[PDB]
């Protein structure tokens, strides 16, 4: 079927068909372009006219330009041949290594797994990060979301997780860069080549990369996450593999939809977002899941606009996650890194019957003492430290020591900090925090717990200060 362009507004293109109106979500190819310009049908306008979202720039489009219907949605190559390669939103290679020669192509639009396919296994996933493993531990096959404002450490944390989990991972991995820095994608590509996780010479590569970055028009930024989902879903279903899916940044998805929502002719919702924010997010996120056919452990960095966690996009994302690591700018200005907010990060396996009564008690006691410190903060700020009781001063001192000991030097942060990274086992974390809560280190200064690994390094640093 062939139609003709009748209107071009930004990323939105109206196409009028004389015969054979293409279904919604079909991919159309514009004729007369130097590169492949794909339009995805979004609405049927009536009078044999459809409204489409362009996957590339619409500059140079002329009213009346011919458009062919492919007969199917955007289909990307899926298989083990995509491992070690970089593809864009429409499945084309962008690594200059030639065609991705798979034996099967999958549409980026698919149905979410049914209710009878869901899994319930909730085994922990130790990450080596003290605050994560202690207070909001991740689960294998679960959904992890890293919230944070601009420049608080979402990319640093997700790169630390790639270093600590994906290399030690037995299955495959997919990194979907969505609306982020292109130089960050170049860094990740070359670092994965250096570390052997991507092999340019044989078929031993373990990661597939899908990049649509912040230089892309809103259609590509809205569908590149779906392309990454399709790759991970193939690896989960047809291969039965355990997949790792890193999405940085998923908020861009929502934001991209916002950018087109006005041009699609829809009445705006709260804060100018599309009225379909929650259902679009749900349609996308329900495919990011572990079924009883295969497992997908998902780590999604979630941008928080203007540091407002009540913004509709992060507020809607909160319900789709099994673990949330909420980074805070206030904690990042105290020098504590990672900037995890220990009273805002949660996990669903923080359950005595899952992590053990010892782990549960240490975590809950840490959170109790931090909440008590936060309650005292007002009086401490106005009436000074001296107007408290003895137990209040002891609580403040222990809470500050715990705040310091929650920080940790990362191996991805070695370059701009000099401090060698630390991977702290879960038992050593539980032991160190149990000991701090007990009072076994009430004599050491609080600066001794700042940016160390296990508690033995804390006592060594204490003996090195004095």
């Amino acid at each position: 079927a062939t139609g003709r362009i009748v209107a071009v507004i930004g990323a939105v293109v109206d196409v009028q068909f004389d015969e054979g109106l293409p279904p919604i979500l079909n991919a159309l190819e514009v004729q007369g372009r130097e590169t492949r310009l794909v339009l995805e049908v979004a609405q049927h306008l009536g009078e044999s006219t459809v409204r489409t979202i362009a996957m590339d720039g619409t500059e140079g489009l002329v009213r009346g330009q011919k458009v062919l219907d492919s007969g199917a949605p955007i289909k990307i190559p899926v298989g083990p041949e995509t491992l070690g390669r970089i593809m864009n939103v429409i499945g084309e290679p962008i690594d200059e290594r030639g065609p991705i020669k798979t034996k099967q192509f999958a549409p980026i639009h698919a149905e979410a797994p049914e209710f009878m396919e869901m899994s319930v296994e909730q085994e922990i996933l130790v990450t080596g990060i003290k605050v994560v493993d202690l207070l909001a531990p991740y689960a294998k096959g679960g959904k992890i979301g890293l919230f944070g404002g601009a420049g608080v450490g979402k990319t640093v944390l997700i790169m630390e997780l790639i270093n600590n989990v994906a290399k030690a991972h037995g299955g495959y991995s997919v990194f979907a860069g969505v609306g982020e820095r292109t130089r960050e994608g170049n860094d990740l590509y070359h670092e994965m080549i250096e570390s052997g996780v991507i092999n340019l010479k044989d078929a031993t590569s373990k990661v597939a990369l899908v990049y649509g970055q912040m230089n892309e028009p809103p259609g590509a930024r809205a569908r590149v996450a779906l392309t990454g989902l399709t790759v991970a879903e193939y690896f989960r279903d047809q291969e039965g593999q355990d997949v790792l899916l890193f999405i940085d940044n998923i908020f861009r998805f929502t934001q991209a939809g916002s950018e087109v929502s006005a041009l699609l002719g829809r009445i705006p919702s709260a804060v100018g977002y599309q009225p379909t924010l929650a259902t679009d997010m749900g349609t996308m996120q329900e495919r990011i899941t572990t079924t009883k056919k295969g497992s997908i452990t998902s780590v999604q960095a979630i941008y928080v606009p203007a540091d407002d966690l009540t913004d509709p996009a992060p507020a809607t994302t909160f319900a789709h996650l099994d673990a949330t690591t909420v980074l805070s700018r206030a904690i990042a200005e105290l020098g504590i890194y990672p900037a995890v907010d220990p009273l805002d990060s949660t996990s669903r396996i923080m359950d005595p019957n899952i992590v053990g009564s010892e782990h549960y008690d240490v975590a809950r006691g840490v959170q109790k003492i931090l909440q008590d410190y936060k309650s005292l903060q007002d009086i401490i700020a106005i009436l000074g430290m001296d107007e408290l009781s003895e137990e209040d001063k002891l609580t403040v001192s222990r809470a500050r020591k715990i705040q310091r000991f929650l920080s940790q030097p990362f191996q991805v942060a070695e370059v701009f900090t000099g401090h060698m990274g630390k991977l702290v086992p879960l038992k050593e974390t539980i032991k160190g925090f149990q000991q701090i809560l007990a009072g076994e280190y009430d004599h050491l200064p609080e600066q001794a717990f700042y940016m160390v690994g296990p508690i033995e390094e804390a006592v060594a640093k204490a003996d090195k200060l004095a």
Binding site: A381, I382, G384, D386
Partner: protein
Amino acid sequence: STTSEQSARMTAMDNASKNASEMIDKLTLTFNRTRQAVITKELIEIISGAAAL
């Protein structure tokens, strides 16, 4: 001890007033920010209600 204590209380209340003024300045900035945001949000609601007719 009475003289030492009166001096200490004078300096302590001076410091408390200083800290209270600091918090007042930061909260005044936050208040102006929030009132501007509230006015903008109400305008946007009225404008979107009028544009749907």
